[PDB]
Amino acid sequence: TLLVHGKDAQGIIKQVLSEVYDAVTSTMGPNGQLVMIKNGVSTKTTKDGVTVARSIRFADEAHELVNRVITEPATKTDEECGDGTTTTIMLTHALYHLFKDFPGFQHHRNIEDLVERVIQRLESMAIRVEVDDPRLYQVALTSSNQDEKLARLVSELYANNKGSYPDIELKEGVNFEDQIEQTTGRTIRMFYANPWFAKGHQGGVTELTGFTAFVIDRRIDKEDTQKLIDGVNHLVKTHKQHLALPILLIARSFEEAANSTLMQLNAAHPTLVEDGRPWLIPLSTPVGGAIGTSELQDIAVMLNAPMLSDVADLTKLDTHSINGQHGQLELGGNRSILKSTTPKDEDRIEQHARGIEELLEGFSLSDKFSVRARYNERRIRTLRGKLITISVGGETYSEVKERVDRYEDVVKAIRSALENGILPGGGVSLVKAVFGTIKEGLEDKDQSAEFAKRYINSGIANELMRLSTIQHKLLFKDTALYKENGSFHFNDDWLNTPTVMNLATGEIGTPEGLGIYDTAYASITALKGGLQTAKILATTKTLILG
Amino acid sequence: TLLVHGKDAQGIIKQVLSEVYDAVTSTMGPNGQLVMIKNGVSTKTTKDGVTVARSIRFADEAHELVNRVITEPATKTDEECGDGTTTTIMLTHALYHLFKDFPGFQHHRNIEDLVERVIQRLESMAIRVEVDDPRLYQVALTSSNQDEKLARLVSELYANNKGSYPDIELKEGVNFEDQIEQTTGRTIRMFYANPWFAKGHQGGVTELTGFTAFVIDRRIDKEDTQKLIDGVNHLVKTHKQHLALPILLIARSFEEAANSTLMQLNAAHPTLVEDGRPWLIPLSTPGTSELQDIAVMLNAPMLSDVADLTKLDTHSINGQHGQLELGGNRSILKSTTPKDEDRIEQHARGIEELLEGFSLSDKFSVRARYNERRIRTLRGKLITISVGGETYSEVKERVDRYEDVVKAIRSALENGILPGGGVSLVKAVFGTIKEGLEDKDQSAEFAKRYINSGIANELMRLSTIQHKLLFKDTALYKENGSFHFNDDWLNTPTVMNLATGEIGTPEGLGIYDTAYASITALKGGLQTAKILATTKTLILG
Amino acid sequence: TLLVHGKDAQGIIKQVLSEVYDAVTSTMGPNGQLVMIKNGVSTKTTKDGVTVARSIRFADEAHELVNRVITEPATKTDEECGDGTTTTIMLTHALYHLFKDFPGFQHHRNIEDLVERVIQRLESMAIRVEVDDPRLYQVALTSSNQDEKLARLVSELYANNKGSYPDIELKEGVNFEDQIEQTTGRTIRMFYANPWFAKGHQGGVTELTGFTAFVIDRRIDKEDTQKLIDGVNHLVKTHKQHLALPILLIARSFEEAANSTLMQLNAAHPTLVEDGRPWLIPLSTPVGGAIGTSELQDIAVMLNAPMLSDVADLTKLDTHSINGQHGQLELGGNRSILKSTTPKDEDRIEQHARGIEELLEGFSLSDKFSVRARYNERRIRTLRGKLITISVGGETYSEVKERVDRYEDVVKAIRSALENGILPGGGVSLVKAVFGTIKEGLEDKDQSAEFAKRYINSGIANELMRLSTIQHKLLFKDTALYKENGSFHFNDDWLNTPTVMNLATGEIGTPEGLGIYDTAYASITALKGGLQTAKILATTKTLILG
């Protein structure tokens, strides 16, 4: 196959980036266009940035090669969060033109460092919203495409349950009206190690009404095969009297060498098999690290299981350590779900939750916004979280499944709003961050000498100010903000009291006043990922098609 | 594949919408042309708007992609009502030009709001015709191709049965004259799960004079096999004294795993078999509340789970002694005692009271129309007309002519009536403009948005399109170059009866349309128009 | 596929109609050309209008789409009558140009109404020929391609059997000479409801020497299944002594629900099965209407069967009502054939035939030409008709099968001549019909005011007179009628005494004098069917190929 080198490669890259930019950005705004995508023998017409991005194809192999570097990182890999795909493509285009305008390795290490300092302001500027706070309705209204009914319902579900963070599932209903099912049940991060251990021996959803859990810390492989045989047979022989089946062996990871051993151990005692159900189930959790250790401690407290460091610790056990529960559990390939929790168990969980809360109370104000505190909050939410199943209804079949997706967008938005934070929308938080960072470095008289040389005198600082305006421009062009002159220009005063336009109503004010917000994690990740992809495209000189 | 963006996308869209307009509109009028469609190795020649629309194909993929957005919503999705497809494509093309003429997002939100107020007027203008009302004769006389005898008989069939909506079946008779068979009986949506359970064990028509029905909600498969064995044997052993055979197990769906189990359960008790008839019949229905109607008709208890069959009593179990005719297509009730009809009428009033307390917009929704379909099933009589004539061909043609009359009268009472000839839309637009302008409270805002812009005036020109195509090349457009409406014509409209050749009012002559068809054409036309106008990108990959 | 609209659709329609016209009309006349059709690896050379029309194909789909509208209605659907296909295609072309010349919906409704009054004149003008009348020879001579031997023989067969109308079948013989086989046997319109009831259980030709028939009036479906079980078992149990197998249940129609029931009823009594033959056979008749009721009465009289209104009437029966015949019958999938009729039965048939004849004797002269009288005559002919089998011979194999077809044309001509009527040939009857209708409307002073405005002053009446001439022109162009001037023109005097030319002899005279005749039904149907197809072609604006 052909080999492209030199000015032609940088030529192809510039063209593909341009065409992808034009197709995705046209979706944004009040004059927001619509894209008509062909799929088989049907037609799907949409204005969704992610769905547009996923579907763009090119004929030439050289063109498709570049296309898989701009779209696919924020398209195929981005499965957890759909939002912020339009933003990432948009910023990539912006920052690519910045790397081309200031060429050479010396400038590049300055650009990368300034943008990194802008990212440090956005992470600081994020407003941590509380459950009771009415701002959630504004976020819910924006994410629902101006739905008055849905945004009221979902905002109430979080606000009424002040103390517990609700987990929400969605199913296609039958009626015209919606129906809500509230349940006091917890969601756990454990899942099957092997499909054989489930009901029907093929990775099914096993429902239980009694168990005896044991939490191991170590990652289990071929080295621990003997320790499992010694451990399992000790409990089955000696401590069978005070044991409710099945025995759950929760751990970090179960390798295939260990799983095959535990399959044979189930076959060793065929008397304890009830209706096909295996009496021993290995259960893995995707955590890792010393931060990740304490998630298994939550798993231990929920199910009255003892914490064990080594696999060989299964031998040295007693009636004080072993505790078989008689509640209700639903094991699954994706995740396990608890349901029936006795008042005696809920006392133990709430006491353990208070222990985590007390640790957060005795930390500094700066460390409250850190990864440590937010993870410890994620621990609490898992320990005190309720399951809600909403069955969405409507007039037809197509209107139901579309409304299901519109519900899912609102749930994802409100979850991430309470989790990560909130920033002023309308393309304002990025302009505030850049203009903040330039002013901070210039005003700080210690490093002002170096800061002026690298950024201010170069014209990097000024060119970066022009880039932050991009989003605000696309949203509020062809409207009454850009009416007085050819183009609107920001000043020092506008940073204190920003100016936007509510497209639904038709009024001018501050994002804080009107109520336009974005999720912090989406906007931050867009800048991080936009910087990385821009750098790659600017510094590529060769395309190999063989 | 290729990616089309910019002026080219709006270039293709304009072309395809143009071609589909020309092909479908040519069908309308007295100079209604004919379309020659190819199917296999034959030729179908027709002037039916829907059939033309369904069949138009394009060679280019881009062109075909757009074609599926303009035709297919009023073609493939529209299965319940065939009429109002020529009307929707017409309005789509009209409103598309209105959006291109006033570009930019501010104008668009003003158009969408004015048209929304026009829709509200049509829903108000709609004459909801009653059973006893003599206007049905005018609809019957038009639809039967000026038949004096047929329009009289069918209109009398509806008018004499004031209180019950008659379901009419048609059969090819034997005599010159027609013969009518009236029956006080209801049609039900239940049918055999397996052919074995019928009379003769081969899907026959089993006639019964007594039964004990039980309505289950769940879909039944291999998982419910044990629950059926526990359920059936409980009633046969314990509650045999107050039980009239056969036991009817009505449900959503019976899978083959469950049907085979219930076949063996019939064989388990051979003493209860009378003249071959199986004493247990599973019955499926193709909508949770439709089974509630089935439950009320046959005095059956509503049951969520299959295991609920065990926990039952004389209070819950009620064996009827009426008359039922089970069938592979549908089941038919006949003998209903005065005690049962009190329960059915009380349940029918409960559905009617729910419809009384809804908004005016929701009365034309799927919710209200489904609930009306529930009522008509609960209060409907079966009539069998055997159509006769001189030859064989004259009979079967007269059968079709009867069927068109039934379809017309059903839809007239069901949906509503509006002045035909493209008059109701002109009355709606000109009404809404005058109402907003005359109302001195909002006259300041109304003038700025609609009147001064030229939106109001351009929208008046659009409503004329249908009246133009129907009555161009005739004596209305004779005096001058083009006919123009005035203030006086709204009070007393002007059309032309193409059959007779006379000028008058639609009320006088007798030209009417179904209300739901014309309303939904405007709604669906507005949505498809907006999408077409606002599309700038086509993805062919 | 492509979509053709506007002036191009009308462009194609005109061309295809033109080509088909030229090919089929060149066949007609004394200078009647020949068409050389390819079939497989052989060559068929013919001057037959129907065979030419059936075989014309086009390469383009648009052209072939139209071709199936002009040929196929008088080609594929027209199976009963082969003759009058050259006439129909000719008239289509003519009337198409009449609709194009006077466009607009107001003119069209006037054309259709005038042509309709011409049709009414042709049905009035029809000469009802009698069996003894010698004119049949002239019809026989023209249809046989001037055969002196064949036209003499077939004309004698009808003339000698004065009273009974002979049914003629044809078979490929062995000798050089022909051989005639006369049999006193009747043809009935009954046939198998299902193929299972025949000999071999696969729709074979069951031959019988005894039966007991029962004629039901009603159309039988799922509703009559119980009435059949009660009916059949009543006769099999009670009245078995005076019953000759098989039991024939003749009716209007047997649906598949009823047929399956009667299959099981045969299996119920296996003792009465003789050599595979089912003892119960349902038999349908294609009639419909209350005119059609009396054909079953003929069926009842032939086989000594009782007339029954309801299916439940089978129960209430007795030795006086039940009568089992011991003649000879041949059941068939197409039709049933009676053979052996005893002198006692022939007395009953002749008495019933006289009853129908007496009804015709006491009607008005106008009603003798109506549908009522002609149907009642068709009843008589079925009740008194004899079977004749002619085995046609010749010198080779090909000369025999060609002579078979030439016999079949003569039979079809003479049958329809006596049945329908006779009109003056040479394209004269249509000229007399048009010129009659115009003169009648113009002369009638009551409607003369309206008639002149619609037809005369418009020029429709004059243009219609020119079209009737078309057939007469094609036949007698390039001969001594068109000799004195450029073209022959009709006058007032020629309507009283028409002028043609006998092409065999070479003489000028009246069609009545010389002896040129046409079958009335062929010429009438050609005008009706030609008008309908002309209208469709003129009014088509769109062609869909997808």
- Burial annotation A124-139 (CB, 10 A radius, 16+ → b, else e): ebbeebeeeeebbbbb
Orientation of helix A520-538 relative to helix A61-70, angle to 10°: 140
Encoding tokens for residue A209?
């009404």
DSSP symbol at B423: T
| Rounded-to-10 torsion of CA C450, C455, C459, C462 | -130
Place of tokens 């007798």: B510
Single-letter residue type at B345 = E
C49 near C27, Cβ under 8 Å? yes
C near A: at least 3 beta-carbon pairs less than 8 Å apart: no
Single-letter residue type at B286 = P
Helix or strand run (H / E) with residue A194: none
B375 near B399, Cβ under 8 Å? no
**How many C-beta atoms surround the C-beta of residue A151 within 10 A?**
22
DSSP annotation string for C414-440: HHHHHHT-EEETTTTHHHHHHHHHHHH
C-alpha–C-alpha distance, residues C448 and C464, integer Å: 18
C233 near C261, Cβ under 8 Å? no
Encoding tokens for residue B53?
């629309």
Long-range contacts of B510-513, Cβ-Cβ distance < 8 Å, separation of 24 or more? B510/B138, B510/B141, B510/B142, B511/B142, B511/B419, B511/B420, B511/B421, B512/B135, B512/B138, B512/B139, B512/B142, B512/B412, B512/B417, B512/B418, B512/B419, B512/B420, B513/B417, B513/B418, B513/B419, B513/B420, B513/B424
Residue C73: asked if its preceding bond is cis (omega within 30°), the reply is no
Residues 6+ apart with CB under 8 A from C149: none
Residues 6+ apart with CB under 8 A from B394: C289
Residues 6+ apart with CB under 8 A from C316: none
**How many C-beta atoms surround the C-beta of residue C90 within 10 A?**
21
The bridge status of strand B207-208 relative to strand B219-220 is unpaired
Instruction: Please name every residue paired with A546 in a beta bridge, in sequence order, or none if there are none.
Output: none
C-alpha–C-alpha distance, residues C90 and C81, integer Å: 17
B283 near B206, Cβ under 8 Å? no
B138 near B510, Cβ under 8 Å? yes
Place of tokens 């179990």: B317
The bridge status of strand A179-183 relative to strand C540-544 is unpaired
Which burial class, exposed, middle or buried, applies to A106 when counting CB atoms under 10 A from its CB (0-12, 13-18, 19+)?
Answer: exposed
Question: Who among C1, C69, C544 is closest to B35 (CB)?
Answer: C544
Helix or strand run (H / E) with residue B13: helix B7-25
C-alpha distances out from residue B525 to B80, B115, B531, Å: 18, 11, 10
Helix or strand run (H / E) with residue A266: helix A256-268
B149 near B387, Cβ under 8 Å? no
C-alpha–C-alpha distance, residues C44 and C46, integer Å: 6
C287 near B172, Cβ under 8 Å? no
Helix or strand run (H / E) with residue A79: none
DSSP symbol at B300: P
Orientation of helix C136-143 relative to helix C398-419, angle to 10°: 150
Q: In angstroms, what separates the C-alpha of B303 from chain A's closest C-alpha?
A: 18
Known binding residues of A are: 29, 48-50, 83-87, 409, 426-427, 471, 502-503, 518
C-alpha–C-alpha distance, residues A183 and A386, integer Å: 6
The verdict on C286 touching B (C-beta cutoff 8 Å) is yes
Instruction: Please name every residue paired with A216 in a beta bridge, in sequence order, or none if there are none.
Output: A308
A382 near A298, Cβ under 8 Å? yes
Q: What angle do CA C484, C489, C493 make, to 5 degrees?
A: 105
Residue A246: asked if its preceding bond is cis (omega within 30°), the reply is yes
Q: Please report residues of B whose CB lies closer than 8 A to that of C220.
A: none
Which of B199, B204, B201, B168 is CA-nearest to residue B183?
A: B168
Which of A348, A339, A341, A347 is CA-nearest to residue A387?
A: A339
Place of tokens 């506007």: C6
C-alpha–C-alpha distance, residues C66 and C537, integer Å: 8
Long-range contacts of A488-496, Cβ-Cβ distance < 8 Å, separation of 24 or more? A490/A431, A490/A435, A495/A431, A495/A432, A495/A435, A495/A436
Residue A278: asked if its preceding bond is cis (omega within 30°), the reply is no
User: What resolution in angstroms, rounded to 1 decimal?
Assistant: 3.5
Which of A92, A58, A99 is CA-nearest to residue A73?
A: A92
Residues 6+ apart with CB under 8 A from A361: none
C-alpha distances out from residue A442 to A96, A249, A435, A446, A449, Å: 25, 59, 11, 9, 8
B57 near B86, Cβ under 8 Å? no
Q: Please report residues of B whose CB lies closer than 8 A to that of C542.
A: 23, 26, 33-36, 52
Counted residue by residue, chain B has a size of 541
Encoding tokens for residue A397?
């079949």
Pick among B27, B174, B206, B275 to test the C interface (most C CBs inside 10 A): B174
The bridge status of strand C247-250 relative to strand C212-216 is parallel
Counted residue by residue, chain C has a size of 546
Residues 6+ apart with CB under 8 A from C63: C12, C15, C16
Q: Chain-centre distance of CA C237, in angstroms? A: 45
DSSP annotation string for A445-470: TTTHHHHIIIIITTTHHHHHHHHHTH
Name the residue in chain B with its Cα closest to that of A32: B534
Encoding tokens for residue A164?
């517990």
C-alpha–C-alpha distance, residues A66 and A9, integer Å: 10
C17 near C96, Cβ under 8 Å? yes
The verdict on whether residue B87 carries a ligand-binding annotation is yes
Instruction: Please name every residue paired with C500 in a beta bridge, in sequence order, or none if there are none.
Output: C509
Single-letter residue type at A247 = I
Which of B465, B458, B497, B368 is CA-nearest to residue B88?
A: B465
C-alpha distances out from residue B143 to B148, B303, B394, C109, C221, Å: 11, 46, 18, 20, 31
Across chain A, how many H-helices and E-strands are there? 19, 22
DSSP symbol at C306: P
Encoding tokens for residue C261?
């029931």
The verdict on whether residue B86 carries a ligand-binding annotation is yes
C327 near C342, Cβ under 8 Å? yes
Q: Please report residues of C whose CB lies closer than 8 A to that of B52.
A: 542, 544
Encoding tokens for residue C325?
């015949």
C-alpha–C-alpha distance, residues A318 and B66, integer Å: 73
Contact C290 B35 (CB under 8 A): no
Single-letter residue type at B22 = D
Helix or strand run (H / E) with residue C145: none
C-alpha–C-alpha distance, residues C368 and C362, integer Å: 10
Name the residue in chain C with its Cα closest to that of B325: C223
Strand, helix or coil at A391? strand
Which of A119, A126, A50 is CA-nearest to residue A83?
A: A50
Which of B271, B234, B240, B248 is CA-nearest to residue B198?
A: B248
Contact A35 B537 (CB under 8 A): yes
**What SS3 string covers A118-156?**
HHHHHHHHCECCCCCCCHHHHHHHHHCCCCHHHHHHHHH
Strand extents, DSSP E, C399-526 = 422-424, 500-502, 507-509, 517-519
C-alpha–C-alpha distance, residues A439 and A122, integer Å: 15
Strand, helix or coil at B172? strand
C-alpha–C-alpha distance, residues C5 and A464, integer Å: 59
C388 near C157, Cβ under 8 Å? yes
Place of tokens 């005065």: B338
Residues 6+ apart with CB under 8 A from C282: C192, C193, C194, C197, C220, C249, C251, C254, C258, C259, C262
C-alpha–C-alpha distance, residues C49 and C75, integer Å: 10
Residues 6+ apart with CB under 8 A from B149: none
B93 near B17, Cβ under 8 Å? yes
Encoding tokens for residue C349?
């048939």
C-alpha–C-alpha distance, residues C522 and C416, integer Å: 9
Place of tokens 């062009």: A477
User: Which of residues 175 through 214 in chain A touch B, CB cutoff 8 A?
Assistant: 175-176
Single-letter residue type at A200 = G
**How many C-beta atoms surround the C-beta of residue A83 within 10 A?**
21
C-alpha–C-alpha distance, residues C449 and C67, integer Å: 42
Encoding tokens for residue C425?
């040939």
A95 near A534, Cβ under 8 Å? yes
Name the residue in chain C with its Cα closest to that of B390: C289
Encoding tokens for residue A384?
């005190």
Which burial class, exposed, middle or buried, applies to B147 when counting CB atoms under 10 A from its CB (0-12, 13-18, 19+)?
Answer: middle
Radius of gyration of chain C (CA): 28
Instruction: Please name every residue paired with A518 in a beta bridge, in sequence order, or none if there are none.
Output: A423
The verdict on A39 touching B (C-beta cutoff 8 Å) is no
C-alpha–C-alpha distance, residues A267 and A196, integer Å: 12
C345 near C304, Cβ under 8 Å? yes
C-alpha–C-alpha distance, residues C321 and C307, integer Å: 9
Which of C293, C250, C529, C528 is CA-nearest to residue B389?
A: C293
Long-range contacts of A74-79, Cβ-Cβ distance < 8 Å, separation of 24 or more? A74/A529, A75/A50, A78/A50
Question: Who among B65, B535, B536 is closest to A38 (CB)?
Answer: B65
Instruction: Please name every residue paired with C509 in a beta bridge, in sequence order, or none if there are none.
Output: C500
